[PDB]
Design a protein around this ligand. Structure first.
Ligand SMILES: *[C@H]1O[C@H](CO)[C@@H](O[C@H]2O[C@H](CO)[C@@H](O[C@H]3O[C@H](CO[C@H]4O[C@H](CO)[C@@H](O)[C@H](O)[C@@H]4O)[C@@H](O)[C@H](O[C@@H]4O[C@H](CO)[C@@H](O)[C@H](O)[C@@H]4O)[C@@H]3O)[C@H](O)[C@H]2NC(C)=O)[C@H](O)[C@H]1NC(C)=O
Ligand SMILES: *[C@H]1O[C@H](CO[C@H]2O[C@@H](C)[C@@H](O)[C@@H](O)[C@@H]2O)[C@@H](O[C@H]2O[C@H](CO)[C@@H](O[C@@H]3O[C@H](CO)[C@@H](O)[C@H](O)[C@@H]3O)[C@H](O)[C@H]2NC(C)=O)[C@H](O)[C@H]1NC(C)=O
Ligand SMILES: *[C@@H]1O[C@H](CO[C@H]2O[C@@H](C)[C@@H](O)[C@@H](O)[C@@H]2O)[C@@H](O[C@@H]2O[C@H](CO)[C@@H](O)[C@H](O)[C@H]2NC(C)=O)[C@H](O)[C@H]1NC(C)=O
Ligand SMILES: *[C@@H]1O[C@H](CO)[C@@H](O[C@@H]2O[C@H](CO)[C@@H](O)[C@H](O)[C@H]2NC(C)=O)[C@H](O)[C@H]1NC(C)=O
Ligand SMILES: *[C@@H]1O[C@H](CO)[C@@H](O[C@H]2O[C@H](CO)[C@@H](O)[C@H](O)[C@H]2NC(C)=O)[C@H](O)[C@H]1NC(C)=O
Ligand SMILES: *[C@@H]1O[C@H](CO)[C@@H](O[C@H]2O[C@H](CO)[C@@H](O)[C@H](O)[C@H]2NC(C)=O)[C@H](O)[C@H]1NC(C)=O
Ligand SMILES: *[C@H]1O[C@H](CO)[C@@H](O[C@@H]2O[C@H](CO)[C@@H](O)[C@H](O)[C@H]2NC(C)=O)[C@H](O)[C@H]1NC(C)=O
Ligand SMILES: *[C@@H]1O[C@H](CO)[C@@H](O)[C@H](O)[C@H]1NC(C)=O
Ligand SMILES: *[C@@H]1O[C@H](CO)[C@@H](O)[C@H](O)[C@H]1NC(C)=O
Ligand SMILES: *[C@@H]1O[C@H](CO)[C@@H](O)[C@H](O)[C@H]1NC(C)=O
Ligand SMILES: *[C@H]1O[C@H](CO)[C@@H](O)[C@H](O)[C@H]1NC(C)=O
Ligand SMILES: C[C@@H]1O[C@@H](O)[C@@H](O)[C@H](O)[C@@H]1O
Length: 663
């Protein structure tokens, strides 16, 4: 039966057929979702006349009794989605007044007569989607004074009369949704009849260029701001297409998923108030210097997947030409992901003088080499972020970035870079904060590799194969303010121990899968801000005393997947703030207190399973006792902590080891 938390009585997937009484009378909620109820007799609700929100979505309800509302005088949100209600009457919701949200989302209510919501002078959001409606008309007089969000998507409405919307004579609508209706015409004045219209959703309504043109006329001279037209048949645009919007202060426009092939010249010259524009998922063939004329106030532009695709046969690629964005002088964000553009041009980005975030992931096809001229079109953009993942880049040249003097994030991962870093690629990055090089072919380092980027703070070199790493002074030496150094899966041939000297601000160090055992001293020298340290998978099997001396800030240490067994007492003497310890899949035999006491003191989480535990009081008594009385999190205790010796204890669960009989 029903479970009852704070003031709410949840009875969701039980397959009920009756309304339960066991529940409190001090509840102001009641989730009867997803059951089997015939209907909701206006009498069985007395016990909880405190019901603030009755949620009976997804049942078999057929009719609603008028008395229900009055028997429940504090019903604010009623939900009857996906029920079986037939037709609403003039007398049904006649009592519900404190109502703020009514949802009749899925009841196949084909027709509406009279004024069924005359008294809902408080209803803030009405939902009548997915029925059989063929008219927007819900009344005869100016009613629903306070309505704010009318949802009527997924119906069968073919026309917007001026007559069938006047009941909103003075209703400040924030959102009218008519998505998924087969609109064949918009009569004159249809959208004017509303008090105020702010946001309109006409997705997936089968609109084409002409009907969209007549749509924008009917929108002239209304307070609309968000207009969404995604997923229609708007194959091309003219200057006349959006002209009717010059008489509006439109702000946001969605034009994705329309199969848009050709943006006419000046298709947007009457949108000087637009800030957000989406062109995602389309087939733009060309962008010319005239394409975005008029968008002098634009801020966010997404052209992700907005171009001509690959196609099965012909090698087709869009053609954006110099200056296409020369008018977007207030733009700060530009997403150009997932497209088949060949490369940049010496003036591709010119005019974007307020740009900050430029995304170019999986954007280019014919690049592969970056040169001193590739990004010259941004020499005048205050860029902070540059994404270049997935472009098949293989070489970066001297001075490539000298233009982006104000960059902070640089992302060159998932590429095929293959070269030696003389240090001159970064020439000019005065403010760079993070550089991402993970998932590349190979980088040959040098004494100067990062000499010109001292402001750096985060550097990732995962899965890259590093050459020339045992060189003094270390290649990481100039990075005094470095805080994250994630370089794993490189398997470095020789690691001189000078590495990492001077990284006083280092907080995270990732050195996994780098066969660190061979070269092995005292790696971690003065890294007293180290918090997270991962040395997983290095074939380690005899770790020195002193490598953790003075790392008082360690919160997690991961030495899993090595060959550790014998540990010198006091190694973890300084790790008393440790929250997490993982030595899983090692060769540990004993778990003594002179080694594991300190760290265990405050540990929130421990992972030490898959180890040849020796079941003898000398090896585990202290351990097994500690395990019984600690609040620490140990997972899979009962099954993945088994004893290995002696004979009689092969595979016996550690936690079951009797300790009483010990001394
Ligand atoms: C510039 O542009 C790049 C391209 O869009 C963008 O790349 C990525 O952006 C984010 C940030 O990493 C990724 O978001 C998520 O997916 C990543 C991998 O998750 C995997 O697993 C989930 C779960 O099954 C799948 O849904 C998913 O498809 C994938 O298989 C990953 O980044 C992240 O997941 C993980 O989070 C953990 C947090 O505790 C990590 O340990 C773990 O290592 C992993 O990061 C996240 O959920 C995008 O997937 C990725 N974009 C794509 C589509 O390739 C760059 O971030 C952006 N560059 C920057 C840094 O500005
Ligand atoms: C760019 O990348 C490398 C660095 O060049 C930069 O050095 C700065 C100190 C600064 O003066 C910048 O103006 C300059 O661009 C450079 O590396 C190779 O070429 C260097 C010549 O600049 C080589 O230096 C050596 O210099 C001695 C001096 O006489 C000379 O005899 C010797 O032959 C050699 O040239 C350096 O050894 C080179 N590094 C290696 C081995 O790769 C790149 O050439 C520059 N890129 C290009 C091709 O433009
Ligand atoms: C589009 O242009 C302006 C937008 O400016 C108005 O926007 C309002 C939402 C409000 O927050 C404020 O920014 C400003 O009132 C509208 O012009 C305004 O119209 C009102 C009433 O007619 C006047 O009293 C204002 O003075 C006037 N601003 C100016 C300086 O002309 C304009 O009405 C609007 N057009 C449409 C079709 O909505
Ligand atoms: C948009 O306008 C530009 C000019 O700003 C057009 O440029 C020329 O258009 C004519 C007519 O097709 C042809 O000469 C060339 O296609 C273009 N050459 C020159 C001189 O620039 C451009 O073609 C127009 N493109 C559209 C309709 O998207
Ligand atoms: C129009 O566009 C979006 C709706 O998703 C909203 O625009 C912006 O401001 C909102 C705050 O009112 C934020 O919640 C949005 O995240 C933000 N948009 C961006 C770029 O992410 C705005 O609410 C919408 N107007 C409506 C629906 O009335
Ligand atoms: C990249 O570096 C500069 C920046 O554009 C280019 O121009 C300089 O080098 C040229 C030799 O190729 C000289 O002819 C130019 O005069 C010189 N700039 C000056 C000082 O006026 C250079 O060509 C580019 N080199 C490459 C391709 O890496
Ligand atoms: C690395 O970190 C230090 C933080 O102390 C940076 O110094 C700061 O920034 C400027 C120097 O450009 C100083 O005038 C400020 O007083 C410092 N405080 C901060 C954080 O605002 C130092 O510059 C950084 N390394 C670089 C980029 O050289
Ligand atoms: C309402 O209460 C009466 C009490 O006799 C009960 O018989 C009836 O089944 C209840 N209604 C339903 C079907 O929930
Ligand atoms: C909107 O509210 C009522 C509708 O019943 C109307 O009489 C009134 O004139 C309108 N608001 C104004 C302008 O007073
Ligand atoms: C691990 O589980 C125990 C449950 O007894 C919990 O009390 C402890 O807080 C958990 N560890 C964490 C998340 O700190
Ligand atoms: C746990 O084991 C200890 C011995 O270390 C014993 O005293 C205690 O009763 C046990 N309690 C359980 C079953 O958790
Ligand atoms: C070459 C083109 O010529 C006209 O069409 C101008 O209106 C454009 O701005 C462009 O300069």
């Amino acid at each position: 039966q029903c479970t009852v938390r704070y003031n709410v009585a949840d009875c969701s997937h039980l397959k009920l057929t009756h309304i339960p009484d066991d529940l409190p009378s001090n509840i102001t909620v009641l989730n009867l979702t997803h059951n089997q109820l015939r209907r909701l007799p206006p009498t069985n609700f007395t016990r909880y006349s405190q019901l603030a929100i009755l949620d009976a979505g997804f049942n078999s309800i057929s009719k609603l009794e008028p008395e229900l509302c009055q028997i429940l005088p504090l019903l604010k949100v009623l939900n009857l989605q996906h029920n079986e209600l037939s037709q609403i009457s003039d007398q049904t919701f006649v009592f519900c007044t404190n109502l703020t949200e009514l949802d009749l989302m899925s009841n196949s209510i084909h027709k509406i007569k009279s004024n069924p919501f005359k008294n809902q002078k408080n209803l803030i959001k009405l939902d009548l989607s997915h029925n059989g409606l063929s008219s927007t008309k819900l009344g005869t007089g100016v009613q629903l004074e306070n309505l704010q969000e009318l949802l009527l998507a997924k119906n069968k409405i073919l026309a917007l009369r001026s007559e069938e919307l006047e009941f909103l004579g003075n209703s400040s609508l924030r959102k009218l949704d008519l998505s998924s209706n087969p609109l064949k015409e918009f009569s004159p004045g249809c959208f004017q009849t509303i008090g105020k219209l702010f946001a309109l959703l006409l997705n997936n309504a089968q609109l084409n260029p002409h009907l969209t043109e007549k749509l924008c006329w009917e929108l002239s001279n209304t307070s609309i701001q968000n207009l969404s037209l995604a997923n229609n048949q708007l194959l091309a645009t003219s200057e006349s297409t959006f002209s009717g919007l010059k008489w509006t202060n439109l702000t946001q426009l969605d034009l994705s998923y329309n199969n848009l092939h050709d943006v006419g010249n000046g298709s947007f010259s009457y949108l000087p108030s637009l800030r957000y524009l989406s062109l995602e998922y389309n087939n733009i063939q060309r962008l010319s210097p005239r394409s975005f004329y008029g968008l002098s106030n634009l801020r966010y532009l997404s052209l992700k997947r907005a171009f001509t695709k690959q196609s099965v046969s012909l090698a087709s690629h869009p053609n954006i030409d110099d200056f296409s964005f020369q008018w977007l002088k207030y733009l700060e964000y530009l997403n150009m992901d997932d497209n088949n553009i060949p490369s940049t041009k010496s003036n591709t980005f010119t005019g974007l003088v307020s740009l900050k975030y430029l995304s170019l992931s999986k954007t280019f096809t014919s690049l592969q080499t970056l040169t001193n001229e590739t990004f010259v079109s941004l020499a005048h953009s205050p860029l902070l972020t540059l994404n270049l993942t997935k472009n098949h880049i293989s070489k970066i040249a001297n001075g490539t970035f000298s233009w982006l003097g104000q960059l902070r994030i640089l992302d060159l991962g998932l590429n095929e870079i293959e070269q030696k870093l003389s240090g001159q690629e970064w020439r000019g990055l005065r403010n760079i904060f993070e550089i991402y090089l993970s998932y590349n072919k190979y980088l040959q380092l040098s004494t100067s590799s990062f000499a010109l980027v001292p402001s750096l703070q985060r550097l990732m070199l995962r899965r890259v194969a590093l050459k020339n790493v045992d060189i003094s002074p270390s290649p990481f030496r100039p990075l005094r303010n470095l805080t994250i150094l994630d370089l794993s899966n490189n398997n470095i041939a020789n690691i001189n121990e000078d590495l990492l000297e001077g990284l006083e601000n280092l907080e995270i160090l990732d050195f996994q899968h780098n066969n660190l055992a061979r070269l092995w001293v005292n790696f971690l020298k003065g890294l007293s801000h180290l918090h997270i340290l991962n040395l997983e998978s290095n074939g380690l099997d005899e770790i020195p005393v002193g490598v953790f001396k003075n790392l008082f800030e360690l919160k997690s240490i991961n030495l899993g997947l090595n060959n550790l067994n014998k540990l010198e007492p006091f190694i973890f003497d300084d790790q008393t703030s440790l929250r997490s310890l993982n030595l899983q899949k090692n060769l540990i035999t004993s778990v003594e207190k002179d080694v594991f006491g300190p760290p265990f003191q405050n540990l929130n989480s421990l992972d030490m399973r898959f180890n040849p535990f020796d079941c003898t009081c000398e090896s585990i008594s202290w351990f097994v006792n500690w395990i019984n009385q600690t609040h620490t999190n140990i997972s899979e205790l009962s099954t993945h902590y088994l004893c290995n010796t002696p004979h009689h204890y092969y595979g016996f669960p550690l936690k079951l080891f009797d300790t009483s009989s010990c001394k």
